[PDB]
Design an enzyme around this catalytic site. Sequence first.
Site, mmCIF file in Angstrom:
data_model
loop_
_atom_site.group_PDB
_atom_site.id
_atom_site.type_symbol
_atom_site.label_atom_id
_atom_site.label_comp_id
_atom_site.label_asym_id
_atom_site.label_seq_id
_atom_site.Cartn_x
_atom_site.Cartn_y
_atom_site.Cartn_z
ATOM 1 N N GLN A 1 0.809 -1.211 0.000
ATOM 2 C CA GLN A 1 0.000 0.000 0.000
ATOM 3 C C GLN A 1 0.846 1.266 0.000
ATOM 4 O O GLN A 1 0.297 2.358 -0.187
ATOM 5 C CB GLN A 1 -0.949 0.013 1.201
ATOM 6 C CG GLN A 1 -0.261 -0.075 2.554
ATOM 7 C CD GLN A 1 -1.074 0.562 3.664
ATOM 8 O OE1 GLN A 1 -1.946 1.396 3.415
ATOM 9 N NE2 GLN A 1 -0.787 0.175 4.901
ATOM 10 N N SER B 1 -6.575 3.165 10.184
ATOM 11 C CA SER B 1 -7.285 2.903 8.941
ATOM 12 C C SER B 1 -6.322 3.158 7.789
ATOM 13 O O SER B 1 -5.944 4.306 7.531
ATOM 14 C CB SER B 1 -8.522 3.790 8.842
ATOM 15 O OG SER B 1 -9.382 3.341 7.813
ATOM 16 N N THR C 1 -5.440 7.693 10.353
ATOM 17 C CA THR C 1 -5.065 7.143 9.064
ATOM 18 C C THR C 1 -3.636 6.622 9.118
ATOM 19 O O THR C 1 -2.841 7.001 9.984
ATOM 20 C CB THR C 1 -5.177 8.198 7.960
ATOM 21 O OG1 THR C 1 -4.134 9.169 8.112
ATOM 22 C CG2 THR C 1 -6.528 8.900 8.007
ATOM 23 N N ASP C 2 -3.314 5.735 8.182
ATOM 24 C CA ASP C 2 -1.917 5.461 7.903
ATOM 25 C C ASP C 2 -1.297 6.682 7.224
ATOM 26 O O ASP C 2 -1.985 7.649 6.887
ATOM 27 C CB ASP C 2 -1.775 4.210 7.037
ATOM 28 C CG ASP C 2 -0.436 3.524 7.221
ATOM 29 O OD1 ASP C 2 0.535 4.206 7.612
ATOM 30 O OD2 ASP C 2 -0.357 2.301 6.981
ATOM 31 N N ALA C 3 0.020 6.635 7.033
ATOM 32 C CA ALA C 3 0.757 7.794 6.540
ATOM 33 C C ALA C 3 0.147 8.321 5.249
ATOM 34 O O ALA C 3 -0.083 7.565 4.302
ATOM 35 C CB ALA C 3 2.225 7.423 6.321
#
Length: 555
Positions: free
Chosen positions: A198, A233, A280-282
């Site tokens: 991702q 997320s 959130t993720d990065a």
Amino acid sequence: MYESILSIKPYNLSKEQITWVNQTLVSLSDDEKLGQLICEIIWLDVMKHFLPGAVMYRPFKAKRMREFTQRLQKASKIPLLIACNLERGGSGGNGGMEDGTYVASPMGVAATDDESSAEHLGEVCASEGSAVGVNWTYEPIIDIDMNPENPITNVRTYGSDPERIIRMAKAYCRGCRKWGVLTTIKHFPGDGVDYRDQHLMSSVNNLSADEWMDTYGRIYQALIEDGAETLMSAHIRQPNVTRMVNPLIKDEEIMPGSLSKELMQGILRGRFHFNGLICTDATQMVGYTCSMPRHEALPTSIQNGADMLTFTLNPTEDFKALQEGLSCGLLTHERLDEAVARILGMKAKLRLPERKDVVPPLHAMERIQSKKHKKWALEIADESITLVKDKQKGLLPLSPQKTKRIILVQATNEKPEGGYLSEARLFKGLLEKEGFIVHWFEEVPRPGTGYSIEDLKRDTDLFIYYANFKVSSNQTTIRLVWGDSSPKFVCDVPTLFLSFSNPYHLVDVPMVKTYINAYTSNEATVRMMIEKLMGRSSFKGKSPVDPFAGLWDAR
């Protein structure tokens, strides 16, 4: 307000604490509230464009971290959440700190099939992190290592068995909470089905709604009920689950977790009743940036259920985008207040407001690389190393009286100065202590026009492979890359293959007759490997995964 959220798990704030959150919320300007949504990376001049709600430390020295904490907190009106990816202990796994204890990868712990090893892992992570002021670890990963070709899961997971993942993840959290460090379950809606990172795209969890609910959903419900404080997320899509919540959604509208209201509000908040902090993720990962125009994405993420954005790209442009989103309605003032409420509530849960010292006493630093932490690393290594394949009679245990001369072949995707991993040099030196003659592959001839296989068999009694293909962001494969150094003579010279990271290397060396997974490339694991190869220590590890990858030829 917000008593229905703040008074129950995973918050459980008192009347006074809730009053502090509400009064603080009311006192914040719109710009202050928007800044609280942002976690800034420290790689500490991150307050020029806004006042962030949190920060994450990249791996610097423990002392520097302790210094940054004092400075950051003493300068922040609202106390900061201080994040760190304490994945394998104080050190290891591209995160944590530079001089912490590297205990083991999560999969190495899972190989012990003893959840007390995960609790110990969590203790080292949270014990050494909290000593320098960290109060939030982006762990545990509860992805299922289903697809052996996925480069970004692998040893970062507790394997491919949901029940073990639940046991280990809960124990890990148990160890962290003992030291007052928040935990983070990731990566929702779940990595490990796809084979793609991702970091480089929006990967897809393409299980059916039922299949996902029966596996990933089961794990998340288990950790949510266990008291998971925060959830990450990520930029992973689950189209079938999304369609279940919104049957009329168009394939082009299906967003990844970090942008999906069906996943974050339909499943998490609604069906699963998750009440903790969502981040959130990065945000600079391709999976996020390619899914939607950024000026729209950042406010939409919050509007659709996320409480916090992890990292900025251009901080000025990003904050301006949040301002405009709130102004024009992409983000509602009502959702903004609810996000800040959950952010402030976790700061109140940690009792950061009342604290009047910030960092623990310097004596806390003595836990870092303590004897107990080093000792747990040696126990886990003793219990994790797994004899996967042993189809060469009489090879083990090794002894210089059976195979005096050894060619040591390194294989890695790292680029260590000098050409060789310090862990591989150590392994080599310890073999020589036992009485072996050990040359690197690069030091001796190989069959060709001027060197025969008979010559090789005259000079070589055994090949040993040291394989370390580690997980890192933006790698599309951690497969074994070389090719004359490959085990191409297994029927002419006995050959032993040792994996100190990726457990699926039999995919690329299926001809090998003796194969051992160790999951971790550190001094503790190397030393136990020597003890086990020499017959002084039994092989106790159990594969938490299928190391053959369903390949008929690997056996």
